[PDB]
Design a protein around this ligand. Structure first.
Ligand code: CL
Ligand code: CL
Ligand code: CL
Ligand code: CL
Ligand code: CL
Ligand code: CL
Ligand code: CL
Ligand code: CL
Length: 129
């Protein structure tokens, strides 16, 4: 599924991501924009052989199981395929664990490089939330 901007904001709010760990909804929308362009089906291989999955590009090195990332863990206790669903529940639940892991949203290097410090409220501007 390819979400619209306000549509994804609303879905993230509905699943409790709004201000989770102190990160406003615009931060989460911004991250999703630059990680996946709002496409739940996005996958990308990393150089090290792990893969990033879904709307927030969660990595199989730590967070989900894909059967092909030796030495990796599955800390969200989920198949990585679950992170590609139209329903964003599994990706939000896992993102909540990631952002609680100690470095906040710096875990998403596209958030750190493209969102952090910017006018992230622009991402929810105009949205009926
Ligand atoms: Cl957009
Ligand atoms: Cl915001
Ligand atoms: Cl992989
Ligand atoms: Cl997804
Ligand atoms: Cl594996
Ligand atoms: Cl392994
Ligand atoms: Cl959803
Ligand atoms: Cl980046």
């Amino acid at each position: 599924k390819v979400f619209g901007r306000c549509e994804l904001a609303a879905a993230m709010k509905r699943h409790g991501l709004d201000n989770y760990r102190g990160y406003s909804l615009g931060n989460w929308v911004c991250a999703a924009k630059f990680e996946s362009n709002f496409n739940t089906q996005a996958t990308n291989r990393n150089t090290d052989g792990s893969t990033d999955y879904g709307i927030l590009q969660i990595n199989s090195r730590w967070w989900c199981n894909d059967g092909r990332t030796p030495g990796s863990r599955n800390l969200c206790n989920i198949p990585c395929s679950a992170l590609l669903s139209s329903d964003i529940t599994a990706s939000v639940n896992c993102a909540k664990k990631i952002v609680s892991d100690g470095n906040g949203m710096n875990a998403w290097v596209a958030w750190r490089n493209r969102c952090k410090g910017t006018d992230v409220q622009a991402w929810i501007r105009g949205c009926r939330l």
